[PDB]
Write an enzyme that holds these catalytic residues in place. Structure first.
Site, PDB file in Angstrom:
ATOM      1  N   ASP A  45       0.992  -3.035  -5.528  1.00  0.00           N
ATOM      2  CA  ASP A  45      -0.213  -3.625  -4.667  1.00  0.00           C
ATOM      3  C   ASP A  45      -0.649  -2.553  -3.587  1.00  0.00           C
ATOM      4  OD1 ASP A  45      -0.822  -5.081  -1.781  1.00  0.00           O
ATOM      5  OD2 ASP A  45      -1.386  -6.358  -3.432  1.00  0.00           O
ATOM      6  N   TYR A  50      -4.297   1.052   3.300  1.00  0.00           N
ATOM      7  CA  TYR A  50      -2.859   1.613   3.314  1.00  0.00           C
ATOM      8  C   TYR A  50      -2.531   3.205   3.459  1.00  0.00           C
ATOM      9  CZ  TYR A  50      -1.635  -3.185   1.661  1.00  0.00           C
ATOM     10  OH  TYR A  50      -1.655  -4.409   1.652  1.00  0.00           O
ATOM     11  N   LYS A  79      -7.973  -3.273  -2.406  1.00  0.00           N
ATOM     12  CA  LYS A  79      -8.315  -4.026  -1.686  1.00  0.00           C
ATOM     13  C   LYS A  79      -9.882  -3.491  -0.772  1.00  0.00           C
ATOM     14  CE  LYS A  79      -4.097  -6.179  -0.458  1.00  0.00           C
ATOM     15  NZ  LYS A  79      -3.342  -4.966  -0.624  1.00  0.00           N
ATOM     16  N   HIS A 112     -10.134  -7.484   1.525  1.00  0.00           N
ATOM     17  CA  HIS A 112      -8.725  -7.466   2.196  1.00  0.00           C
ATOM     18  C   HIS A 112      -8.994  -8.777   3.179  1.00  0.00           C
ATOM     19  CE1 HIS A 112      -5.453  -4.304   3.404  1.00  0.00           C
ATOM     20  NE2 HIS A 112      -5.214  -5.608   3.906  1.00  0.00           N
TER      21      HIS A 112
HETATM   22  N1  LIG Z   1      -3.332  -8.840   1.845  1.00  0.00           N
HETATM   23  C1  LIG Z   1      -2.625  -8.505   3.161  1.00  0.00           C
HETATM   24  O1  LIG Z   1      -3.597  -8.625   4.115  1.00  0.00           O
HETATM   25  C2  LIG Z   1      -1.322  -7.767   3.582  1.00  0.00           C
HETATM   26  C3  LIG Z   1      -0.805  -7.891   4.671  1.00  0.00           C
HETATM   27  C4  LIG Z   1       0.503  -7.464   4.628  1.00  0.00           C
HETATM   28  C5  LIG Z   1       1.149  -7.023   3.675  1.00  0.00           C
HETATM   29  N2  LIG Z   1       0.339  -6.948   2.382  1.00  0.00           N
HETATM   30  C6  LIG Z   1       1.201  -6.342   1.445  1.00  0.00           C
HETATM   31  O2  LIG Z   1       2.619  -7.232   1.022  1.00  0.00           O
HETATM   32  C7  LIG Z   1       3.454  -6.274   1.068  1.00  0.00           C
HETATM   33  C8  LIG Z   1       4.714  -6.681   1.496  1.00  0.00           C
HETATM   34  O3  LIG Z   1       4.629  -7.379   3.028  1.00  0.00           O
HETATM   35  P1  LIG Z   1       5.356  -6.667   4.105  1.00  0.00           P
HETATM   36  O4  LIG Z   1       4.784  -5.258   4.493  1.00  0.00           O
HETATM   37  O5  LIG Z   1       5.280  -7.565   5.133  1.00  0.00           O
HETATM   38  O6  LIG Z   1       6.974  -6.326   3.515  1.00  0.00           O
HETATM   39  P2  LIG Z   1       7.955  -7.528   3.250  1.00  0.00           P
HETATM   40  O7  LIG Z   1       7.810  -7.650   1.633  1.00  0.00           O
HETATM   41  O8  LIG Z   1       7.664  -8.819   3.893  1.00  0.00           O
HETATM   42  O9  LIG Z   1       9.321  -6.819   3.316  1.00  0.00           O
HETATM   43  C9  LIG Z   1       9.960  -6.742   4.879  1.00  0.00           C
HETATM   44  C10 LIG Z   1      11.285  -5.850   4.796  1.00  0.00           C
HETATM   45  O10 LIG Z   1      12.067  -6.262   4.057  1.00  0.00           O
HETATM   46  C11 LIG Z   1      13.030  -5.063   3.501  1.00  0.00           C
HETATM   47  N3  LIG Z   1      13.471  -5.323   2.058  1.00  0.00           N
HETATM   48  C12 LIG Z   1      12.694  -5.251   0.989  1.00  0.00           C
HETATM   49  N4  LIG Z   1      13.860  -5.452  -0.225  1.00  0.00           N
HETATM   50  C13 LIG Z   1      14.802  -6.084   0.648  1.00  0.00           C
HETATM   51  C14 LIG Z   1      16.122  -6.696   0.117  1.00  0.00           C
HETATM   52  N5  LIG Z   1      16.446  -6.896  -1.147  1.00  0.00           N
HETATM   53  N6  LIG Z   1      16.965  -6.896   1.205  1.00  0.00           N
HETATM   54  C15 LIG Z   1      16.589  -6.764   2.278  1.00  0.00           C
HETATM   55  N7  LIG Z   1      15.413  -6.133   2.874  1.00  0.00           N
HETATM   56  C16 LIG Z   1      14.527  -5.961   2.018  1.00  0.00           C
HETATM   57  C17 LIG Z   1      12.246  -4.035   3.643  1.00  0.00           C
HETATM   58  O11 LIG Z   1      12.544  -3.042   4.261  1.00  0.00           O
HETATM   59  P3  LIG Z   1      13.046  -1.371   3.612  1.00  0.00           P
HETATM   60  O12 LIG Z   1      11.441  -0.783   3.409  1.00  0.00           O
HETATM   61  O13 LIG Z   1      13.890  -0.568   4.442  1.00  0.00           O
HETATM   62  O14 LIG Z   1      13.722  -1.716   2.258  1.00  0.00           O
HETATM   63  C18 LIG Z   1      10.788  -4.578   4.025  1.00  0.00           C
HETATM   64  O15 LIG Z   1      10.401  -3.610   5.106  1.00  0.00           O
HETATM   65  C19 LIG Z   1       3.163  -4.970   1.914  1.00  0.00           C
HETATM   66  O16 LIG Z   1       3.558  -4.034   1.309  1.00  0.00           O
HETATM   67  C20 LIG Z   1       1.479  -5.153   1.336  1.00  0.00           C
HETATM   68  O17 LIG Z   1       1.293  -4.430   0.304  1.00  0.00           O
HETATM   69  C21 LIG Z   1      -0.699  -7.388   2.203  1.00  0.00           C
HETATM   70  C1  LIG Z   2      -0.914  -3.733   8.139  1.00  0.00           C
HETATM   71  C2  LIG Z   2      -0.611  -4.080   6.937  1.00  0.00           C
HETATM   72  C3  LIG Z   2      -2.004  -4.728   6.395  1.00  0.00           C
HETATM   73  C4  LIG Z   2      -1.857  -5.117   4.781  1.00  0.00           C
HETATM   74  O1  LIG Z   2      -2.770  -5.322   4.246  1.00  0.00           O
HETATM   75  O2  LIG Z   2      -0.746  -4.811   4.453  1.00  0.00           O
HETATM   76  C5  LIG Z   2      -2.513  -6.088   7.027  1.00  0.00           C
HETATM   77  C6  LIG Z   2      -1.434  -6.806   7.818  1.00  0.00           C
HETATM   78  C7  LIG Z   2      -1.856  -7.921   8.250  1.00  0.00           C
HETATM   79  C8  LIG Z   2      -3.140  -8.474   8.518  1.00  0.00           C
HETATM   80  C9  LIG Z   2      -3.671  -9.640   9.096  1.00  0.00           C
HETATM   81  C10 LIG Z   2      -3.103  -9.927  10.603  1.00  0.00           C
HETATM   82  C11 LIG Z   2      -3.471 -10.902  11.406  1.00  0.00           C
HETATM   83 CL1  LIG Z   2      -3.101 -11.289  12.912  1.00  0.00          CL
HETATM   84  C12 LIG Z   2      -4.232 -12.143  10.378  1.00  0.00           C
HETATM   85  C13 LIG Z   2      -4.415 -11.838   9.318  1.00  0.00           C
HETATM   86 CL2  LIG Z   2      -5.264 -13.249   8.297  1.00  0.00          CL
HETATM   87  C14 LIG Z   2      -3.964 -10.586   8.624  1.00  0.00           C
HETATM   88  C15 LIG Z   2      -4.026  -7.621   7.902  1.00  0.00           C
HETATM   89  C16 LIG Z   2      -5.610  -7.822   8.176  1.00  0.00           C
HETATM   90  F1  LIG Z   2      -5.962  -8.715   7.093  1.00  0.00           F
HETATM   91  F2  LIG Z   2      -5.980  -8.314   9.209  1.00  0.00           F
HETATM   92  F3  LIG Z   2      -6.432  -6.707   7.788  1.00  0.00           F
HETATM   93  C17 LIG Z   2      -3.842  -6.569   7.289  1.00  0.00           C
END
Ligand SMILES: NC(=O)c1ccc[n+]([C@@H]2O[C@H](COP(=O)([O-])OP(=O)(O)OC[C@H]3O[C@@H](n4cnc5c(N)ncnc54)[C@H](OP(=O)(O)O)[C@@H]3O)[C@@H](O)[C@H]2O)c1
Ligand SMILES: CC[C@@H](C(=O)O)c1ccc(-c2cc(Cl)cc(Cl)c2)c(C(F)(F)F)c1
Length: 315
Positions: A45, A50, A79, A112
């Site tokens: 992903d 990013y 995205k 996104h």
């Molecule tokens: N569509 C969107 O708007 C959106 C928003 C936010 C995120 N995302 C995507 O979702 C992915 C994950 O979300 P997130 O960024 O919040 O991270 P997350 O999956 O919630 O992980 C949080 C922390 O948990 C740690 N971790 C990983 N494996 C672990 C394990 N087995 N045991 C303990 N800790 C562990 C990691 O630290 P370490 O790195 O030190 O291992 C990571 O920093 C992102 O990378 C992104 O691609 C998308």
């Molecule tokens: C930085 C990481 C990034 C990712 O995509 O990983 C990311 C994280 C969180 C959000 C987000 C934040 C709020 Cl407060 C509300 C909502 Cl709905 C979404 C966003 C977004 F969508 F705003 F751009 C992007």
């Protein structure tokens, strides 16, 4: 270990989150993506926001050139960032992501976020008082341009991210709709289980995709330091004791058993390989119930800037 989307395509049930804050050098994204593929991850992903599609794209091609994996085995997700929401900006933003990732196509291309921003090359358009500058775009027209990308063969599947139900209904009830969003990637974890939204997507054959399933990276930019730590929850720890697993494996398995495609970000080789261990064990019907009861409607990302956006999904 894949789920069928409503367009016929299949997406791996577990995906590798590739976001790291900009303070991490971008060389790490190239290395951990290799470690993640070696560990078993096929669903990767990423996003234009990013700033790692250059490195993630090279890691994919490296592991392909190794013979370790083939391109068809890899499910790449990108995205469309908010600044490129206008219809004439969608296809150029996708081929730019393709050019930087050295890919002929993305497996999944998402909107996104529904919160449109001012168009331009800058990703955080700021004004003279520190305000992020909003924009007004009909997302149905944005989606039409996504449909043209799928027909052009640049994205096998298309979907959305951070949409609420009514924002989804707007797309589902669009006159002339050709393709439905295969997925809707939102924040989901035992504290924010999104059960109501999940039943809605299931009744339309839309795959819910959980990000921040491990409770997020807790960046001080967006997360209150007083919010509870997810993987320090007594119930998830007590289940980690019962199945001799980790609190993180419990959080990921919970989403898998409820029909949610889960993402898991990690930049540590040992925690990357440990995450794919989510397929080795299973939770009982009772344990799934215990995790459902942790819900507290707590989204770790909270900012006053986006909360005043008319497309801010939460309420
Ligand atoms: N569509 C969107 O708007 C959106 C928003 C936010 C995120 N995302 C995507 O979702 C992915 C994950 O979300 P997130 O960024 O919040 O991270 P997350 O999956 O919630 O992980 C949080 C922390 O948990 C740690 N971790 C990983 N494996 C672990 C394990 N087995 N045991 C303990 N800790 C562990 C990691 O630290 P370490 O790195 O030190 O291992 C990571 O920093 C992102 O990378 C992104 O691609 C998308
Ligand atoms: C930085 C990481 C990034 C990712 O995509 O990983 C990311 C994280 C969180 C959000 C987000 C934040 C709020 Cl407060 C509300 C909502 Cl709905 C979404 C966003 C977004 F969508 F705003 F751009 C992007």
């Amino acid at each position: 270990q894949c789920v069928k989307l409503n367009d016929g395509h299949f997406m791996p049930v577990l995906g590798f989150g590739t976001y790291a804050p900009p303070e991490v050098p971008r060389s790490k994204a190239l290395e951990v993506t290799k470690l993640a593929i070696e560990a078993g991850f096929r669903h990767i992903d990423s996003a234009h926001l990013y700033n790692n599609e250059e490195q993630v794209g090279l890691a994919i091609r490296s592991k392909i050139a190794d013979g370790s994996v083939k391109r068809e085995d890899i499910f790449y997700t990108s995205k469309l960032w908010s600044t490129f929401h206008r219809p004439e900006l969608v296809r150029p933003a996708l081929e730019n992501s393709l050019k930087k990732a050295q890919l002929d196509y993305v497996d999944l291309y998402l909107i996104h976020s529904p919160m449109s921003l001012k168009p331009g090359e800058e990703l955080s358009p700021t004004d003279e008082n520190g305000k992020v500058i909003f924009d007004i775009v009909d997302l149905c027209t944005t989606w039409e341009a996504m449909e043209k990308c799928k027909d052009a063969g640049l994205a096998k599947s298309i979907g959305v991210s951070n949409f609420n139900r009514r924002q989804l209904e707007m797309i589902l009830n669009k006159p002339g709709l050709k393709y439905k969003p295969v997925c809707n990637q939102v924040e989901c974890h035992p504290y924010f289980n999104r059960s109501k939204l999940l039943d809605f997507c299931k009744s339309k054959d839309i795959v819910l995709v959980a990000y921040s399933a491990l409770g997020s990276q807790r960046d001080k930019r967006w997360v209150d330091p007083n919010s509870p730590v997810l993987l320090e929850d007594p119930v998830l720890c007590a289940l980690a004791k019962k199945h001799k697993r980790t609190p993180a494996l419990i959080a990921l398995r919970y989403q898998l058993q409820r029909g949610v495609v889960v993402l898991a970000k990690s930049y540590n080789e040992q925690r990357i390989r440990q995450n794919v261990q989510v397929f080795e064990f299973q939770l009982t019907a009772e344990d799934m119930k215990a995790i459902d009861g942790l819900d507290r409607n707590l989204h770790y990302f909270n900012s006053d800037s986006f909360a005043s956006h008319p497309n801010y999904p939460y309420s």
